[PDB]
Amino acid sequence: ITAKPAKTPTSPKEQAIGLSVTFLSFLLPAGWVLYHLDNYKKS
Amino acid sequence: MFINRWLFSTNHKDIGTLYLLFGAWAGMVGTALSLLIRAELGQPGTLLGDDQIYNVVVTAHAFVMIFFMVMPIMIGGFGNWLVPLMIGAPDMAFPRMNNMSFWLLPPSFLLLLASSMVEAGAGTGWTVYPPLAGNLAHAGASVDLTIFSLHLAGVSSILGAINFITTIINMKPPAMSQYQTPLFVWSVMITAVLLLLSLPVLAAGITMLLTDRNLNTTFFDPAGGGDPILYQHLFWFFGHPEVYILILPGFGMISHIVTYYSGKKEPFGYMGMVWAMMSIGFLGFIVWAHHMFTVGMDVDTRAYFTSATMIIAIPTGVKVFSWLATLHGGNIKWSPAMMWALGFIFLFTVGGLTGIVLANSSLDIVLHDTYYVVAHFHYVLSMGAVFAIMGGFVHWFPLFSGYTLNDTWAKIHFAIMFVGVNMTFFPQHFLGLSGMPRRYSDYPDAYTMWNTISSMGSFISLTAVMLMVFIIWEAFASKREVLTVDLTTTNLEWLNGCPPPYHTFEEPTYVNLK
Amino acid sequence: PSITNKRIVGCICEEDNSTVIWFWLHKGEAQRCPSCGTHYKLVPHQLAH
Amino acid sequence: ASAAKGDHGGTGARTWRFLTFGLALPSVALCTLNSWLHSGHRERPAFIPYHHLRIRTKPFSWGDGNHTFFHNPRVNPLPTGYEK
Amino acid sequence: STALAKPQMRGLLARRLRFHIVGAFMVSLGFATFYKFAVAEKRKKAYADFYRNYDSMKDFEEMRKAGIFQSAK
Amino acid sequence: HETDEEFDARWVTYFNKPDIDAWELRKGMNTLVGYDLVPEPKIIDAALRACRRLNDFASAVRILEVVKDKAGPHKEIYPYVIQELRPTLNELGISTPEELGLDKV
Amino acid sequence: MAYPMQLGFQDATSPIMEELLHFHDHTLMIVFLISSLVLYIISLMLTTKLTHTSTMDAQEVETIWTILPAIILILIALPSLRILYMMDEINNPSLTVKTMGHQWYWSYEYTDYEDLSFDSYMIPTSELKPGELRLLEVDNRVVLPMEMTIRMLVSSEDVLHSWAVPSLGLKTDAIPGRLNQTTLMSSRPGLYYGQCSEICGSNHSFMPIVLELVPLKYFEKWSASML
Amino acid sequence: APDFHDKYGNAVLASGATFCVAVWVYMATQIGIEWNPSPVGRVTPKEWR
Amino acid sequence: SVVKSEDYALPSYVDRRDYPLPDVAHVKNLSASQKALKEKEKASWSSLSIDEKVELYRLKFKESFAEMNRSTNEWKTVVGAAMFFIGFTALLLIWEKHYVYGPIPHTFEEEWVAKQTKRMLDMKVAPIQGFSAKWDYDKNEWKK
Amino acid sequence: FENRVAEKQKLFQEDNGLPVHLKGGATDNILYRVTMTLCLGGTLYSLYCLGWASFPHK
Amino acid sequence: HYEEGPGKNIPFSVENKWRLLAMMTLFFGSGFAAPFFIVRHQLLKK
Ligand SMILES: CCCCCCCCCCCCCCCCCC(=O)OCC(COC(=O)CCCCCCCCCCCCCCCCC)OC(=O)CCCCCCCCCCCCCCCCC
Ligand SMILES: CCCCCCCCCCCCCCCCCC(=O)OCC(COC(=O)CCCCCCCCCCCCCCCCC)OC(=O)CCCCCCCCCCCCCCCCC
Ligand code: HEA
Ligand code: HEA
Ligand SMILES: CCCCC/C=C\C/C=C\C/C=C\C/C=C\CCCC(=O)O[C@H](COC(=O)CCCCCCCCCCCCCCCCC)COP(=O)(O)OCCN
Ligand SMILES: CCCCC/C=C/C/C=C/CCCCCCCC(=O)O[C@H](COC(=O)CCCCCCCCCCCCCCC)COP(=O)(O)OCC[N+](C)(C)C
Ligand SMILES: CCCCCC/C=C/CCCCCCCCCC(=O)O[C@H](COC(=O)CCCCCCCCCCCCCCC)COP(=O)(O)OC[C@@H](O)CO
Ligand SMILES: CCCCCC/C=C\CCCCCCCCCC(=O)O[C@H](COC(=O)CCCCCCCCCCCCCCC)COP(=O)(O)OC[C@@H](O)CO
Ligand SMILES: CCCCCCCCCCO[C@@H]1O[C@H](CO)[C@@H](O[C@H]2O[C@H](CO)[C@@H](O)[C@H](O)[C@H]2O)[C@H](O)[C@H]1O
Ligand SMILES: CCCCCCCCCCO[C@@H]1O[C@H](CO)[C@@H](O[C@H]2O[C@H](CO)[C@@H](O)[C@H](O)[C@H]2O)[C@H](O)[C@H]1O
Ligand SMILES: C[C@H](CCC(=O)O)[C@H]1CC[C@H]2[C@@H]3[C@H](O)C[C@@H]4C[C@H](O)CC[C@]4(C)[C@H]3C[C@H](O)[C@]12C
Ligand SMILES: C[C@H](CCC(=O)O)[C@H]1CC[C@H]2[C@@H]3[C@H](O)C[C@@H]4C[C@H](O)CC[C@]4(C)[C@H]3C[C@H](O)[C@]12C
Ligand code: CUA
Ligand SMILES: [Cu+2]
Ligand SMILES: [Mg+2]
Ligand code: NA
Ligand SMILES: [Zn+2]
Incomplete structure (x- = not known):
């Protein structure tokens, strides 16, 4: 396929931010629940 | 304008988009449920609780992946986007009923989530067998919310099936015969026939379970003269066609992808591919009791279901060999979608072959209700249906969106997922042969090593899923607009540009008869 | 016939081919089907036809 | 209804030939195989001169009068039992 | 200089395919032979050798003396 | 179907048509390269001379490139074909991709 | 019982279970062969720059790859059903x-x-x-x-x-x-x-x-x- | 002009591999995961009754 | 040179080694000197210079076969990044082991395993091939 | 009765931009608001009921 | 009519990539978090 160059280029720094935010949005809430499992069961 | 467009849609592309977003969100839910299963099993002992909370998670994992991820994505998403464009039709036959098939799914999902929040959840397995799923062993609302969730998903797909069959039979160009329509269109028509015939029977069975739970019937209760095994017959009369429903649109997309990235104008053996899908659809209705080889059936019945089940390998093998023959002599473009399809061909074959092992009812005595079954069906579902979905998604994302993905990231994503799924499921064969049961929250110590590896595999697949979300973000963030697409002369769905206008084929194609 | 200045043509090159060849036919000189060369010419009009 | 498949996009000779070679003759081939396996002569059962069987109210109009038309000595006893 | 000879120019893909399908078939036979020896026959022979002079009463007495049974001390 | 000689002859005849047009030249070469063969020099010869009657130097060079490409890993084929075409290349003034530097990546 | 790192079936304790082991060995050999053959053919289709993209006739080759799988299925089904019925035998x-x-x-x-x-x-x-x-x-x-x-x-x-x-x-x-x-x-x-x-x-x-x-x-x- | 892969490929490959090996080896050996390997050739059986 | 979105219904240029003669020329608009060159192309090509022949080629086509077919270093990036993210996954597993999983059951203690092993040998677990077959009951050691 | 289909054909083909579900006039708007209000209000009530049923009640 | 073209045939805005990141983060993150919080809920009952 061919395509135009990006209209709004996403630099490596911007990609590192997007990827870090994406990963943290999955990992932090689950991590919080799993970290506290004992407090839930011991309750 | 926003509500008119997105809540009152009568447009096959936008509804297709709605289904793709719904199934992507469901895929996250089902992935999280899968990581909770593998966390529980990732070391010996008990992590969460006993088998009830564990098997609420298992039960939901399966219903989410099947009814809210695979089927909405393949049929509601790719079906709605691609089928009208591939036959030059201006929309679906029933464009407003189409929208109700979509909008029934968020309430169906809400009912399943509600089932897991009330009482102690439905910890039944996705098969919902009584008496465990009945009103004494699963008292309270959870199982009834599950039944109703299935009712709504069933109605959604039955009406969608009617829509797809009608559209595909009635709305091709007048010169185009059924044998001039692309294989993905065939694969949707055949899946829709299977949905039309099988889901009413599931609806009958789960309605009988509902009345046994609430109206004092006794269809499945020996005290009234009922039989738990009748429920299993009704469920699996649906449940085996259902797995061909889950894979056939995948087979259709695989045919298009392999053809396209081999630089071919057509798949090898088109009529054999049609024959194979029709044969699979038909044979898929006469095999259901291979899910019941340990329930006490007469030997001649077991002999029949053993033999009929294995027949399906013949048309399926024609498809595999025909994909290989499509690659043969190709100018191979090693795009990410091609990698997904090549991984499909091989891993689907492995899972089909272990299904043929299981078809042998004598061996199935020992393998039934063990992880060998789990290994068979995740090879065809996580490395088959899902690989076809990811292949189709990366291939047609520029058509749907007008923007390109970063191919290097998409290849990284494939590589991670390929390692993760094989690390998750390959060791499960050993656990099954050596006798680890299904639906267990913990296992004898001997089974630790392979369970540990399997759970580590599941975290690799989590990393791939997170990366997938980032990749979609990066594409919409960077806005590389598509210019030219190769091979439009044999891929009509691209010929209206990327994305195609809201209305396409307002003036239909011209095709003569000669 | 067309109510605009281009329309998609599908060309079934030989009887019972399952492969249809699709291309845009534009107003002007006749064009040939990429696969088999059959000629097509657009005859645009208003829908009073 | 109950089966599967799914054409009906326009009936014609090509579709019925497709059904002939792709479904009907394969069925016959499969049943021919199945029959070729479960063949082989079963053990014949002890003769018991039941009075509701081997009926003879009038001699048959061929042979010695006491043999049925497609008499098979191996499996069809006479009123007096199997032949030698 | 010498001219270059004319090489084969037609059917090169088909020739490659034929040659390797045949090599694949030969390897498939090579593997089936190795598997029957190293796996299938090995198993038959392990079971036949184990049971050839097996003394189930002796086996039971060893287990009994080791203390493994509820029903036999 | 037809023998190798009947195939080559059909293709030689096709490109030798005096008033062959540009559409037919492209349709011809793009069809030819789908077969499992490298085209015989006599076919390529006819196609180059078609390029000449069509005043299209560039397509003549491209045709030489696709001969090399169709040979795949059989590195002996393309220099043989060029060798056999040298009289035509010289008569028509066609430079090879190599002589033009177009074989550099 | 199962033991750590076990790959296959537990050792047979009954003659029927021994029968299953030999039948599984037979079937697994076929599974390995077919899956290897497919992986290998994939690699072979993908490892050449030679091309042939014109239309390919399918009739002759589909005999092969219907008849060979039918034969293989029958080689599985025969010992499979033998064990099935032997498990059902009166004893x-x-x-x-x-x-x-x-x-x-x-x-x-x-x-x-x-x-x-x-x-x-x-x-x-x-x-x-x-x-x-x-x-x-x-x-x-x-x-x-x-x-x-x-x-x-x-x-x-x-x-x-x-x-x-x-x-x-x-x-x-x-x-x-x-x-x-x-x-x-x-x-x-x-x-x-x-x-x-x-x-x-x-x-x-x-x-x-x-x-x-x-x-x-x-x-x-x-x-x-x-x- | 050299692209991303020309400029950075060697380093991405070397660093990725070194990191992956090191972190999996540490996970597998240093944090108390119980792999439960076979006792065969490893465990000296000890009187239990 | 400049391909536009609103051109998608028009014949387009592609570089594909299996479609060597695309539907349009790479460059359709010609300068004065490029016009003169196309006129000269109507005369004997032997009178064209090498630079003129190259220019004619680059008007007709964008990349040569050698250019369009070139190999790249992309695999290094793909394989290295995949290994990076697989390594990252191991960080999640270290975290999980540290903060989520508690002690495993006491049956994996070394002494328990040693006693459990002897008892499995005493009951002759898998004595034909799998487990006890690998123990030498006469020499009281694992078979070498 | 008399055949008044022609009159209804005129009404529903009037070039007023209205979607078919409102093209009958003001009564369509009322029945639409009643339906949507019951659906949206009912759906909120059902969420409330889920919330209630999600916890034990001694 | 409706807007047509890239970024316009979808029910979410792609006009600002950081607002988009936030929206996608809430969207996929809410789906992935839901089972963990349902498990917590069931544990906090009994
Ligand atoms: C197939 C999906 C891809 C493969 C994914 C993982 C690949 C790596 C492994 C895998 C590398 C390929 C070899 C597969 C078998 C390896 C184990 C075995 O000895 O299996 C034995 C049997 C029964 O065992 C017994 O009664 C006798 C035991 C003999 C003990 C002797 C020691 C053997 C060595 C120890 C094994 C190490 C454990 C491996 C641990 C592996 C953990 C991931 O178990 C079983 O039935 C397992 C049933 C699996 C059925 C699916 C077949 C798909 C094969 C695809 C192959 C094509 C080429 C792959 C080419 C592969 C590249 C694509
Ligand atoms: C290839 C076999 C594939 C088998 C697949 C089976 C199914 C599995 C899924 C099928 C999966 C298929 C993946 C195949 C990769 C092909 C690479 C390639 O040529 O890509 C193209 C190149 C650029 O190439 C080109 O610009 C031109 C076109 C491409 C070359 C075509 C010509 C080939 C013919 C020449 C060969 C001569 C030999 C003759 C021989 C003939 C004898 C006569 O791109 C590059 O530089 C980078 C590409 C990177 C691919 C890495 C993904 C690996 C995923 C698997 C898990 C890894 C885990 C790692 C992390 C691990 C962590 C633990
Ligand atoms: C995509 C989903 C999918 C697909 C396509 C299949 C396909 C098949 N499955 Fe299924 N299966 C499931 C999803 C799927 N399955 C699920 C979810 C369950 C469990 C349900 C539950 O309990 O929860 C299950 C359970 C299941 C069982 C029950 C086991 C048990 O519970 O004890 C059995 C038994 O026969 C079975 C057999 C088969 C067979 C023979 C096929 C065949 O269609 C496969 C045919 C394919 C090949 C054979 C590969 C390609 C062929 C060649 C390369 C040709 C040459 C091959 C030979 C000659 C053999 N499956
Ligand atoms: C489609 C069906 C499907 C899929 C994809 C999966 C995926 C996975 N399953 Fe699945 N599983 C089932 C269907 C599926 N499962 C079924 C039916 C059961 C039986 C239930 C029962 O016994 O009742 C089951 C049971 C089951 C068990 C056995 C539980 C038990 O017996 O106790 C396990 C254990 O490891 C398991 C683990 C996993 C894992 C780690 C994945 C991972 O591979 C998942 C990784 C993530 C993905 C594959 C991404 C998901 C998709 C998206 C995010 C979509 C992207 C969207 C777009 C591109 C538009 N599953
Ligand atoms: C595909 C294979 C079979 C093909 C058909 C074979 C012949 C059938 C012909 C017509 C059937 C009509 C008469 C039915 C009479 C009985 C024949 C039944 C078919 C048959 O052939 O039956 C045989 C007996 O034949 C016998 O008596 C002797 C039969 C010969 C004498 C028949 C005389 C009677 C004729 C009466 C005709 C009445 C017609 C009325 C029409 C009126 C219309 C208004 C059975 O063989 P068996 O050895 O007893 O058992 C087998 C043990 N190994
Ligand atoms: C797990 C699955 C495997 C199970 C076992 C399966 C094994 C399959 C093995 C099959 C081998 C079949 C090989 C056929 C290759 C030979 C044909 C070919 O490749 O050649 C083509 C024949 O095409 C024609 O007409 C006839 C039609 C086209 C022929 C080419 C297409 C057939 C390709 C089959 C590819 C199979 C790929 C692997 C699949 C397993 C072209 O030939 P022609 O002379 O006409 O043109 C040549 C021009 N001349 C005349 C001037 C030279
Ligand atoms: C188009 C069809 C072509 C023909 C294909 C062949 C179909 C055959 C259906 C035959 C059903 C009747 C058979 C009755 C014979 C008695 C069987 C019986 O009575 O079996 C009972 C269940 O019966 C039962 O038919 C339950 C009966 C219903 C079973 C339905 C199964 C197939 C359903 C297909 C539906 C397709 C849709 C049709 C509508 C268009 C089970 O109990 P037993 O097995 O006794 O076990 C007791 C012993 O183990 C010990 O003492
Ligand atoms: C446990 C309790 C669960 C209850 C779940 C109930 C769920 C659903 C709520 C249903 C609300 C129904 C509202 C009316 C829907 C009418 C659909 C209709 O009539 O659809 C028609 C097409 O379907 C056709 O014909 C043929 C199809 C007509 C179908 C009519 C609707 C059936 C709804 C129930 C379906 C399942 C029934 C059981 C199957 C086992 C028209 O298609 P449109 O795209 O609209 O227009 C096309 C325009 O060209 C017409 O001018
Ligand atoms: C199966 C999918 C899950 C994959 C695994 C997730 C990987 C890691 C995610 C990190 O999650 C965070 O981890 C912290 C610990 O590292 C937790 O802080 C907790 O621990 C801290 C340190 O003890 C305290 O400061 C905090 O207050 C306390 O909430 C925090 O809540 C949780 O969000
Ligand atoms: C436009 C959107 C419409 C949204 C309307 C929301 C209506 C809310 C009314 C609240 O109704 C509650 O529900 C039950 C009935 O209405 C009552 O319970 C009672 O109701 C039953 C009356 O039939 C009895 O059987 C039971 O004993 C008892 O639990 C309860 O008191 C009442 O507060
Ligand atoms: C007759 C029909 C359609 C032919 C056409 O009109 O183009 C073709 C298409 C696929 C064919 C079938 C498939 O190729 C699979 C089988 C191949 C075997 O060689 C013969 C039977 C076999 C079952 C074929 C019979 C018949 O030739 C079929 C069913
Ligand atoms: C008034 C109407 C004439 C039709 C027309 O020209 O409007 C007549 C003709 C047919 C009549 C109907 C049919 O005769 C059938 C019914 C017969 C009952 O005795 C009266 C009600 C009944 C339902 C009739 C009602 C009414 O008088 C109808 C509807
Ligand atoms: Cu009892 Cu499971
Ligand atoms: Cu099934
Ligand atoms: Mg069971
Ligand atoms: Na556990
Ligand atoms: Zn044509």
């Missing part, structure tokens, strides 16, 4: 034992002669004796006579369960209102373990099966002592 047991599934334990009834019955529960991990196996030991084992044909009858007094012993090749669902039959014959004394094999609620993972195979005279005295 004349010399003892019948019933087991009833329950949430979450098994009871056993040996009522050919006296009214002998008892419950059989998992040993809690906190109560294992040194050397005993987590999640597999029971308090009351199913003692049985070795080298004899035993009829096992399986049912349930509540939800579905399933009574399994992998090293004897046994798995029979436990269905309330239904009396399912299987046949058991151990070639050896010893201890043979299985686990409930139909999801049955909160402690499905924790209701195992232990058979204890001993000589007939020991079984008789044990039976007397269990009245």
